[PDB]
Amino acid sequence: EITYSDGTVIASIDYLYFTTLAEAQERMYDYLAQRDNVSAKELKNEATQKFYRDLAAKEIENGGYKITTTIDQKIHSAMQSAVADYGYLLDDGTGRVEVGNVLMDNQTGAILGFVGGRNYQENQNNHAFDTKRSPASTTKPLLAYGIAIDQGLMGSETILSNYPTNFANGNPIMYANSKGTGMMTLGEALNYSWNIPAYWTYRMLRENGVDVKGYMEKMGYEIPEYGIESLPMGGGIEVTVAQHTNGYQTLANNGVYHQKHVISKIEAADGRVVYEYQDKPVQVYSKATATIMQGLLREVLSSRVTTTFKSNLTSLNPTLANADWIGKTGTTGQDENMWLMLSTPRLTLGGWIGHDDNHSLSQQAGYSNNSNYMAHLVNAIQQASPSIWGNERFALDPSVVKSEVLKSTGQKPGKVSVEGKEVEVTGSTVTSYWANKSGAPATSYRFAIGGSDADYQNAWSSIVGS
Amino acid sequence: EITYSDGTVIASIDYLYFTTLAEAQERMYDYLAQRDNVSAKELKNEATQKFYRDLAAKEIENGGYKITTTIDQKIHSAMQSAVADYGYLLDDGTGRVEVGNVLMDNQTGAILGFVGGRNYQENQNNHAFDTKRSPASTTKPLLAYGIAIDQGLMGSETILSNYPTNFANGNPIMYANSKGTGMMTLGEALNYSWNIPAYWTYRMLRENGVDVKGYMEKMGYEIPEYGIESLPMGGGIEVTVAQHTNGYQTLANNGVYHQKHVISKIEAADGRVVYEYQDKPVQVYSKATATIMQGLLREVLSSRVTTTFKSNLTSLNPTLANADWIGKTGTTGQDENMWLMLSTPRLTLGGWIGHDDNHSLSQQAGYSNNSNYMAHLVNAIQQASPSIWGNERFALDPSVVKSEVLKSTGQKPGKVSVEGKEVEVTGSTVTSYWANKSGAPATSYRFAIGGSDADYQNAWSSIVGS
Ligand SMILES: *[B-](O)(O)CNC(=O)c1c(OC)cccc1OC
Ligand SMILES: *[B-](O)(O)CNC(=O)c1c(OC)cccc1OC
Ligand SMILES: [Cl-]
Ligand SMILES: [Cl-]
Ligand SMILES: [Cl-]
Ligand SMILES: [Cl-]
Ligand SMILES: [Cl-]
Ligand SMILES: [Cl-]
Ligand SMILES: [Cl-]
Ligand SMILES: [Cl-]
Ligand SMILES: [Cl-]
Ligand SMILES: [Cl-]
Ligand SMILES: [Cl-]
Ligand SMILES: [Cl-]
Ligand SMILES: [Cl-]
Ligand SMILES: [Cl-]
Ligand SMILES: [Cl-]
Ligand SMILES: [Cl-]
Ligand SMILES: [Cl-]
Ligand SMILES: [Cl-]
Ligand SMILES: [Cl-]
Ligand SMILES: [Cl-]
Ligand SMILES: [Cl-]
Ligand SMILES: [Cl-]
Ligand SMILES: [Cl-]
Ligand SMILES: [Cl-]
Ligand SMILES: [Cl-]
Ligand SMILES: [Cl-]
Ligand SMILES: [Cl-]
Ligand SMILES: [Cl-]
Ligand SMILES: [Cl-]
Ligand SMILES: [Cl-]
Ligand code: NA
Ligand code: NA
């Protein structure tokens, strides 16, 4: 039979059933092929695969295996009741809205609970484990800003260009209906989720030959082509909620990745271990980088620019809203998919909404609807398991380097030549957090990530006038 | 004894007790003085006033009077439970935060319920009816924008200057730490609650000789000096919550004022009517103006720039959050007082928070704390009386005039004299709602409310940009 993590039987041999059943069958496939001495060469034959897949299914059926899952029964039940009771809050006037959520332990990668969809009876597609969609702007902290910080190419108060710029094909890089503004901090870039700063960040990574793919593959992401301008905005990427939750698990867990899983162990009746989850922790980002990103992602939620989440949760459960929440939102180019990823030090909860056929949601479906739904979901989870989110706080690792930098440039105050006239770059300052050894460079002319000659003249006009 | 609106006995002869008792005594005082044929001259004498004041008190105490209040018992009790249960949500790290609320019937001026403070036992000060504080930016819809619209000087998409400008004394007009930006619609001015636009608006009213005082006095505001630069920002105004609620009642009720009251009737034991509230409706703003303002204040709340209220309420009670809420926040110069005024077509709920000794609150006390508290208050009210808020919608009155104007100038497209070459003014347009006969004028060089020559060249720089 299939059990929760506490031995309680889920079933003998709905989303839960079919999902845990499917994972187990995959594990039984590997075991059975190995048992029967099937080489990888013969395992490539498609008729052989169908046989061993059918075999794996019957072994579970007419066999006496104990399948131990990571599922927390109380927490998963409560998530089902939340989507039953509160699912309808997602419906935004563009048809029935589908949903997928995964709740993951940050220290193990274990999946404690999930939401497969609005209602298994009406639609069986598994939106937590099977559906794959662009993660949109939630790509940014992982693939762009996170890597640039880790490479010591950027710190927390570094300045980026959000000046209008075009893709290679002459099209304006857009952010809803805006073609861009001017220079801005990483903080503002993340809080608003502007697109141009992420484009430049990724361009810079390519220019420095960074092994971006090495980072992503260490987190289990399969991206077929890295040579894409809109990659950091989610272009050319498609992920399940379970896999993408694993990325945010990595950032939340001070940069150490643990592979997601639902099955922890399968035993024969007599105790033989057919399968057991083996942990393989990987330091994907430096502790400095991850803890710096946590600080930035904390302000993403607290600024409330792209999500009402903290307001929604404050009202439902103000004590829970005082835990140390960080998170990032995502919106695809036509409002086809909305993401909201949330973490406390203990747990990450991933969330996607969208339509199965990929037509648009409303403009506010992620900002308001999904944020409100996920507040209910977070509150249901806590009510069922009152300690599970924890009261720990995210905190800068000691290894973090702090520089005093000029707010205007994001770099150390000093002299720079602005068209002939060697100039004293003065003015008010902030602490910038870096994940290298030396911190922030002295100010340069091209002080920002990205920007055209025209842009930099314009910016320096402003700066120079004070 | 004193009774609820339905005749149920409140008490025989704690905020509720002393409030209804004190109002009843003022009424008995008037009645007794006239009964005894005391002259207006004689009633100026201080010893005579005191005797009649004492007389009015004992008359109630000993007599067999029946005082009929407007108070709704279920609603008032539920408001007290909310402040008892949820008042702590106001505490923001600047010490114990005090509070006053008044719930008013928009069609009658009757007060259904109120919150005098956090806890009468601990602090007897009545923050609904007694204490007077600057209403800050909740002054703007009433005294500046409202009047300019009624006077046919402004419409809903009219443009205003938020360019830096100084008071007469040379100090910058501030908005938090901003000295201003550029031109902006009335909508954006209202959603953000910028200060400079209101300054210019009131200046314009002065220049036009508008009887501003006549309006405010018809709503029962007592402002001793109108010649004040910061009046439209709440400088030189101090008001009770009950009185200010009456101002928002006026806007909500399509421009028609009804005097606030808690006492509807006082009867001698034998049936003689000692006092009876007499309704005297007044059309303060035209129906056009008021319904245009309603539309603007709907977006103040829905934009969520200065209050999280709509998010807070959506999570508590999504069906109530779909009623037609409009409102305005306010914040005094040093964060000493926060206001949030809310209306549906049926009710108006005013709220203030602050400290008895007038020291600062936190930056977010109004934006988040008071908004969350008031969402709980509003929800408590609805639970106690499920239909009281109504599902009616605010709607433009038919007498409203609609003009197509340039998004850029807020005036009708046309040729203009731009410091040299006559220019054909083109570009995207919108509907602008006016309360006059002829709607928006054709574009003129000085198209916005306020702005220096310097400002106007700069603006026309961009507009002439296309
Ligand atoms: B990211 O997915 O948050 C970038 N977001 C957007 O580009 C975006 C959008 O694109 C069509 C539409 C509305 C809001 C957006 O981001 C706030
Ligand atoms: B009005 O009271 O809304 C004008 N508001 C402000 O000036 C204000 C402020 O001044 C101390 C500080 C923070 C936020 C404000 O309003 C948005
Ligand atoms: Cl399920
Ligand atoms: Cl499934
Ligand atoms: Cl369990
Ligand atoms: Cl997609
Ligand atoms: Cl394109
Ligand atoms: Cl790569
Ligand atoms: Cl993937
Ligand atoms: Cl590549
Ligand atoms: Cl698994
Ligand atoms: Cl490290
Ligand atoms: Cl917060
Ligand atoms: Cl919000
Ligand atoms: Cl669909
Ligand atoms: Cl330094
Ligand atoms: Cl270094
Ligand atoms: Cl350079
Ligand atoms: Cl760069
Ligand atoms: Cl009371
Ligand atoms: Cl009653
Ligand atoms: Cl006047
Ligand atoms: Cl007054
Ligand atoms: Cl005057
Ligand atoms: Cl009264
Ligand atoms: Cl009598
Ligand atoms: Cl009228
Ligand atoms: Cl809304
Ligand atoms: Cl005090
Ligand atoms: Cl017109
Ligand atoms: Cl007219
Ligand atoms: Cl000038
Ligand atoms: Na987003
Ligand atoms: Na305000």
Of B205, B198, B155, B151, whose CA–CA distance to B174 is shortest?
A: B198
Distance CA B23, CA B213 (A): 27
DSSP state of B335: S
Distance CA A322, CA A318 (A): 6
Q: Which two tokens stand for residue A350?
A: 């991933």
| Centroid of chain to Cα A228 | 20
Do residue B337 and residue B421 come from a single domain? Answer: no
Atom of ligand 1 nearest to the CA of A363: 13
Do residue A327 and residue A426 come from a single domain? Answer: no
Do residue B162 and residue B34 come from a single domain? Answer: no
Q: Which two tokens stand for residue B182?
A: 């550029």
Task: Determine contact: B373 vs chain A, CB below 8 A.
Answer: no
- Number of structural domains chain A divides into: 3
Do residue A52 and residue A92 come from a single domain? Answer: no
Domain boundary residue, one of B277, B310, B326: B277
- Beta strand extents in B182-293 (DSSP E only): 183-185, 256-257, 263-267, 273-276, 282-283
Q: Flag whether A222 is marked binding.
A: yes
Residues tagged in the binding site annotation of B for Mg(2+): 220, 222
Domain boundary residue, one of B251, B277, B303: B277
Do residue B110 and residue B3 come from a single domain? Answer: no
Tell the residue number behind the tokens 């200046």, with chain if given. B203
Ligand 9 centroid to residue A10 C-alpha, Å? 29
Residue of the nearest CA to atom 7 in ligand 2? B175
CA angle A303, A306, A310 (to 5 degrees): 55
B128 with B177: CB under 8 angstroms?
no
For residue A433, what are the β-bridge partners?
A402
B21 with B2: CB under 8 angstroms?
yes
Of A204, A219, A79, whose CA–CA distance to A135 is shortest?
A: A219
Ligand 4 centroid to residue A121 C-alpha, Å? 11
Residues in chain A within 8 Å Cβ distance of B314: 308, 312, 368, 372
Nearest to B89 among A89, A316, A318 (CB): A318
3-state SS record for A140-177: HHHHHHHHHHHCCCCCCCCEEECCCCECCCCCECCECC
Q: In CATH, what number is assigned to the domain containing residue B309?
A: 3.40.710.10
The letter for the amino acid at B258 is H
Do residue A90 and residue A180 come from a single domain? Answer: yes
Domain range for residue B47? Answer: 1-71+262-277
A148 with A205: CB under 8 angstroms?
yes
Contacts for B160 with CB less than 8 Å, ≥ 6 apart: B183, B184, B185, B186, B189, B196, B197, B200, B201, B448, B449, B450
| Centroid of chain to Cα B366 | 15
A447 with A464: CB under 8 angstroms?
no
Dihedral sign (CA B175, B178, B182, B184): negative
Task: Determine contact: B212 vs chain A, CB below 8 A.
Answer: no
Task: Determine contact: A369 vs chain B, CB below 8 A.
Answer: no
Label residue A95 left, alpha or beta by phi (over 0 means left) and psi (-120 to 50 means alpha): left
CA angle A350, A351, A352 (to 5 degrees): 135
Q: Which of A193, A196, A239 to mutate to test the pocket of ligand 1 (most atoms within 8 A of CB)?
A: A193
Contact A368 B315 (CB under 8 A): no
Nearest-Cα residue of chain A relative to residue B372: A315
CA distance B63 to chain A (A): 48
Question: For the purposes of burial, counting CB atoms within 10 Å of the CB of B464, is it exposed (0-12), middle (13-18) or buried (19 or more)?
Answer: middle
Q: Which two tokens stand for residue A90?
A: 């997602």
Dihedral sign (CA A30, A36, A41, A46): negative
Of B140, B179, B176, B145, whose CA–CA distance to B163 is shortest?
A: B179
The maximal CA–CA distance of chain B, rounded, in angstroms, is 84
Q: Which of residues 71-100 of A touch B (CB under 8 A)?
A: 89
Distance CA A337, CA A29 (A): 34
A342 with A374: CB under 8 angstroms?
yes
Atom of ligand 1 nearest to the CA of A305: 17
Ligand 22 centroid to residue B214 C-alpha, Å? 7
Q: Is the CB of A193 under 6 A from ligand 1?
A: yes
Do residue B162 and residue B43 come from a single domain? Answer: no
**Torsion angle of the four alpha carbons B418, B424, B429, B430, in this order, in degrees rounded to the nearest 10:** 60
Q: Which two tokens stand for residue A464?
A: 């120079």
Residue of the nearest CA to atom 8 in ligand 1? A176
Q: In CATH, what number is assigned to the domain containing residue A26?
A: 3.90.1310.40
B275 with B30: CB under 8 angstroms?
yes
Of A401, A413, A404, whose CA–CA distance to A431 is shortest?
A: A404
Of B301, B284, B147, B306, whose CA–CA distance to B217 is shortest?
A: B284
Q: In b/e form, how buried is each residue of B28-37, taking b as 16+ CB within 10 angstroms?
A: bbebbbeeee
Distance CA A341, CA A248 (A): 7
CA distance A376 to chain B (A): 8
Do residue A330 and residue A406 come from a single domain? Answer: no
Q: In CATH, what number is assigned to the domain containing residue A428?
A: 3.40.50.12800
H/E element, A189: helix A186-192
Kindly report the backbone phi and psi dihedral angles of residue B289, in degrees, each rounded to the nearest multiple of 5, phi listed first.
Answer: -60, -50
Contact A311 B315 (CB under 8 A): yes
B98 with B356: CB under 8 angstroms?
yes
Kindly report the backbone phi and psi dihedral angles of residue A215, in degrees, each rounded to the nearest multiple of 5, phi listed first.
Answer: -60, -50
Kindly report the backbone phi and psi dihedral angles of residue B79, in degrees, each rounded to the nearest multiple of 5, phi listed first.
Answer: -65, -35
Domain boundary residue, one of A382, A399, A416: A399
3-class state of residue B462 by DSSP: helix
Ligand number nearest to the C-alpha of B2: 21
Q: Which of B143, B174, B175, B352 to mutate to test the pocket of ligand 2 (most atoms within 8 A of CB)?
A: B175
The letter for the amino acid at B54 is D
Task: Determine contact: B313 vs chain A, CB below 8 A.
Answer: yes
Count the Cβ atoms, other than its own, within 10 Å of residue B133: 24
Do residue B112 and residue B246 come from a single domain? Answer: yes
Do residue B200 and residue B95 come from a single domain? Answer: yes
Q: Which two tokens stand for residue B166?
A: 């100084």
A254 with A397: CB under 8 angstroms?
yes
Q: In b/e form, how buried is each residue of B242-271, taking b as 16+ CB within 10 angstroms?
A: bbbbbbbbbbbbbbbbbbbbbbbbbbeeee
Ligand number nearest to the C-alpha of A318: 13
Task: Determine contact: A316 vs chain B, CB below 8 A.
Answer: yes
**Deposited experimental method:** X-ray
Contacts for A218 with CB less than 8 Å, ≥ 6 apart: A257, A282, A284
Contact A315 B311 (CB under 8 A): yes
* Sheet arrangement for strand B263-267: B9-11, B2-3, B66-69, B263-267, B273-276
Distance CA A309, CA A304 (A): 7
Do residue B143 and residue B238 come from a single domain? Answer: yes
- Share in percent of chain A as helix, strand, coil (round to 5): 40, 20, 40
Tell the residue number behind the tokens 């934009």, with chain if given. B303
The letter for the amino acid at A233 is M
Q: Which two tokens stand for residue A119?
A: 């209602």
Do residue A89 and residue A132 come from a single domain? Answer: yes
**DSSP per residue over B249-271, as a string?**
HHHHTTTEE---BSEEEEE-TTS
Task: Determine contact: A271 vs chain B, CB below 8 A.
Answer: no
Of B210, B242, B238, whose CA–CA distance to B144 is shortest?
A: B210
CA distance B368 to chain A (A): 8
For residue A69, what are the β-bridge partners?
A263
Distance CA A134, CA A141 (A): 15
Atom of ligand 1 nearest to the CA of A174: 7
Kindly report the backbone phi and psi dihedral angles of residue A457, in degrees, each rounded to the nearest multiple of 5, phi listed first.
Answer: -60, -50
- What Å distances lie between residue B339 and A288, B176, B239, B369, CA to CA? 42, 16, 11, 11
Distance CA A302, CA A106 (A): 21
A427 with A331: CB under 8 angstroms?
no
CA angle B295, B299, B302 (to 5 degrees): 135
